[PDB]
Structures are given as C-alpha cells and as structure tokens.
Write a protein that holds these residues in place. Structure first.
Motif, PDB file in Angstrom:
ATOM      1  N   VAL A  55      14.079   1.902  -0.548  1.00  0.00           N
ATOM      2  CA  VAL A  55      13.409   0.186   0.303  1.00  0.00           C
ATOM      3  C   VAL A  55      12.285   0.175  -0.589  1.00  0.00           C
ATOM      4  O   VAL A  55      11.727   0.604  -0.891  1.00  0.00           O
ATOM      5  CB  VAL A  55      13.160   1.184   1.275  1.00  0.00           C
ATOM      6  CG1 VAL A  55      12.255  -0.399   2.405  1.00  0.00           C
ATOM      7  CG2 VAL A  55      14.176   1.389   2.187  1.00  0.00           C
ATOM      8  N   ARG A  56      12.281  -1.563  -0.259  1.00  0.00           N
ATOM      9  CA  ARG A  56      10.838  -1.840  -1.203  1.00  0.00           C
ATOM     10  C   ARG A  56       9.948  -1.938  -0.039  1.00  0.00           C
ATOM     11  O   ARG A  56      10.281  -2.773   0.898  1.00  0.00           O
ATOM     12  CB  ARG A  56      11.156  -3.414  -2.051  1.00  0.00           C
ATOM     13  CG  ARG A  56      12.887  -3.516  -2.660  1.00  0.00           C
ATOM     14  CD  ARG A  56      12.014  -3.086  -4.726  1.00  0.00           C
ATOM     15  NE  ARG A  56      13.461  -3.088  -4.973  1.00  0.00           N
ATOM     16  CZ  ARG A  56      12.887  -3.291  -6.577  1.00  0.00           C
ATOM     17  NH1 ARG A  56      11.857  -3.916  -7.125  1.00  0.00           N
ATOM     18  NH2 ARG A  56      14.390  -3.055  -7.787  1.00  0.00           N
ATOM     19  N   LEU A  57       9.157  -1.872  -0.725  1.00  0.00           N
ATOM     20  CA  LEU A  57       7.866  -2.266  -0.006  1.00  0.00           C
ATOM     21  C   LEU A  57       7.760  -3.398   0.617  1.00  0.00           C
ATOM     22  O   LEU A  57       7.019  -3.328   2.007  1.00  0.00           O
ATOM     23  CB  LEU A  57       6.186  -1.828  -1.070  1.00  0.00           C
ATOM     24  CG  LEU A  57       5.020  -1.990  -0.099  1.00  0.00           C
ATOM     25  CD1 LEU A  57       5.076  -0.467   1.221  1.00  0.00           C
ATOM     26  CD2 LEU A  57       3.984  -1.694  -1.057  1.00  0.00           C
ATOM     27  N   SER A  58       8.598  -4.196  -0.380  1.00  0.00           N
ATOM     28  CA  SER A  58       8.199  -6.000   0.693  1.00  0.00           C
ATOM     29  C   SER A  58       8.941  -6.088   2.259  1.00  0.00           C
ATOM     30  O   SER A  58       8.592  -6.800   2.691  1.00  0.00           O
ATOM     31  CB  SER A  58       8.135  -6.721  -0.180  1.00  0.00           C
ATOM     32  OG  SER A  58       9.795  -7.061  -0.819  1.00  0.00           O
ATOM     33  N   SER A  59      10.371  -4.709   1.601  1.00  0.00           N
ATOM     34  CA  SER A  59      11.122  -5.165   3.332  1.00  0.00           C
ATOM     35  C   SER A  59      10.453  -5.244   4.379  1.00  0.00           C
ATOM     36  O   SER A  59      10.953  -4.824   5.714  1.00  0.00           O
ATOM     37  CB  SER A  59      11.076  -4.036   2.708  1.00  0.00           C
ATOM     38  OG  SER A  59      13.334  -4.742   2.222  1.00  0.00           O
ATOM     39  N   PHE A  60       9.041  -3.465   3.649  1.00  0.00           N
ATOM     40  CA  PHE A  60       8.552  -3.429   5.738  1.00  0.00           C
ATOM     41  C   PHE A  60       7.830  -4.705   5.995  1.00  0.00           C
ATOM     42  O   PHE A  60       7.777  -4.591   7.343  1.00  0.00           O
ATOM     43  CB  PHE A  60       7.676  -2.016   5.193  1.00  0.00           C
ATOM     44  CG  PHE A  60       9.108  -0.857   5.569  1.00  0.00           C
ATOM     45  CD1 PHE A  60       9.017  -0.222   6.568  1.00  0.00           C
ATOM     46  CD2 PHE A  60       9.057  -0.416   4.161  1.00  0.00           C
ATOM     47  CE1 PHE A  60       9.624   0.833   6.520  1.00  0.00           C
ATOM     48  CE2 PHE A  60      10.256   1.244   4.045  1.00  0.00           C
ATOM     49  CZ  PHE A  60       9.908   1.796   5.416  1.00  0.00           C
ATOM     50  N   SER A  61       6.943  -5.845   5.445  1.00  0.00           N
ATOM     51  CA  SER A  61       7.122  -6.443   6.345  1.00  0.00           C
ATOM     52  C   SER A  61       8.162  -7.384   7.196  1.00  0.00           C
ATOM     53  O   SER A  61       7.787  -7.829   8.029  1.00  0.00           O
ATOM     54  CB  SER A  61       6.538  -8.084   5.432  1.00  0.00           C
ATOM     55  OG  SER A  61       7.276  -8.467   5.010  1.00  0.00           O
TER      56      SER A  61
END
Ligand code: HEM
Ligand code: XE
Ligand code: XE
Ligand code: XE
Ligand code: XE
Ligand code: XE
Ligand code: XE
Ligand code: XE
Length: 148
Positions: free
Chosen positions: A99-105
């Motif tokens: 999981v990429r940190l950007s996907s948490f938005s």
C-alpha cells in the motif's frame, strides 16, 4: 470538545451494522482506485473484479478489522496518543503488503462517502470536519510506519 461528541454520535449509527457499512466503504474505494484490488492476495491469488472480493471470507474479515480500528479511534478520540504505537506498526504492515501512502487519502474520501450516505441530512459540515480531523490524526500516526 463538541467535535468528540459529533464523532461518537455519528459512529453510533454506523457501528450498529459494521459489515454492511464497511462494504460500502470498500465498494467506493475500488470504484475510485481500482489498482488497490490486487493488493488483497489470499492464497496468492488475485481478485479479477471488485465483486469477486465480496465472496471472500478473508476479505470480509479485513472489513471487520478495519471497522474495529475505527471503533478504537472513536473510543479514544479524546486521547489518541495511546494508539499511536499500534498505528505506526499498522502502517509498517501496510507498507509491506504494497500500500502506497498516497492511497490513504482515497480511503479517507471513501470513509466520508460512507458516512455521508449513512447519515444523510445528519452529516453536517461540522461532522464532516470532525471526521476529517480524526482520520487525519490516524493517518499521521500510521505514516510513521513508512520509514518517515
Ligand atoms: C488501502 C487500503 C488497504 C489495503 C489494500 C489493505 C490490505 C491489507 C492486507 C492485504 C492485510 C493482510 C491480510 C489481512 O489481514 O487481511 C491487511 C491487514 C490489516 N489491515 Fe488493511 N488494508 C487497507 C487499509 C486498512 C485500513 C484503512 C485499516 C484500518 C483503519 C486496516 C486494518 C488492517 C488490520 C487491523 C490488519 C491486521 C494487521 C495485523 O495485525 O497483522 N487496513 N490490510
Ligand atoms: Xe467491494
Ligand atoms: Xe463491488
Ligand atoms: Xe482475524
Ligand atoms: Xe467488527
Ligand atoms: Xe465496530
Ligand atoms: Xe478508514
Ligand atoms: Xe478514523
């Protein structure tokens, strides 16, 4: 705090039926970011389509796990610093699965969607703001799991 009370009151509605509500969250997520689908590899196999994920018992258990973590955040809304270390490790785990940190938005927008749909007229701009700040605090603690 008034924000704390908006969170506890809205969560009360959602937590009556966590799997039904969590299903809405993930259905929305895959509609916004289909590239998250292959990250759920159970027995080393990939779901072809988002509807495939809904017949997987492991995937449904992960929806329950998600809803449990939110419940813990709501429970501790007045003092989140006590979940901080667990959340960091939860971030590290998700970095490892890909999981990429950007996907948490996108996950954040999917949570707000599910709240908006469930609460309707009761999803005020104050409520939206409160959840946004709480999710924000949760993400900050998790993001420490991405090395930085
Ligand atoms: C970008 C979206 C996400 C993807 C692709 C994803 C994927 C996964 C995968 C593949 C696992 C390991 C297999 C499993 O336990 O089912 C996992 C573990 C877990 N996830 Fe997620 N996840 C996502 C978001 C979240 C969010 C937002 C939360 C909570 C707010 C969450 C809570 C958990 C928990 C509690 C575990 C078990 C961790 C452990 O103790 O090992 N995940 N995640
Ligand atoms: Xe889904
Ligand atoms: Xe879906
Ligand atoms: Xe589990
Ligand atoms: Xe749950
Ligand atoms: Xe829950
Ligand atoms: Xe979430
Ligand atoms: Xe949250």
């Amino acid at each position: 705090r008034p924000e704390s009370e908006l969170i506890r009151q809205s969560w009360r509605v959602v937590s009556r039926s966590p799997l039904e509500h969590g299903t809405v969250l993930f259905a929305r997520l895959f509609a916004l970011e289909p590239s998250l689908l292959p990250l759920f590899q159970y027995n080393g196999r990939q779901f072809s389509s988002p509807e495939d994920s809904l017949s997987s018992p492991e995937f449904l258990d992960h929806i329950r796990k998600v809803m449990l973590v939110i419940d813990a955040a709501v429970t501790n809304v007045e003092d989140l610093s006590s979940l901080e270390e667990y959340l960091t490790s939860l971030g590290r785990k998700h970095r490892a699965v890909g999981v990429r940190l950007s996907s948490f938005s996108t996950v954040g927008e999917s949570l707000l969607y599910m709240l908006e749909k469930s609460l309707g007229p009761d999803f005020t701009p104050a409520t939206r703001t409160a959840w946004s700040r709480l999710y924000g605090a949760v993400v900050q603690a998790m993001s420490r799991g991405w090395d930085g």
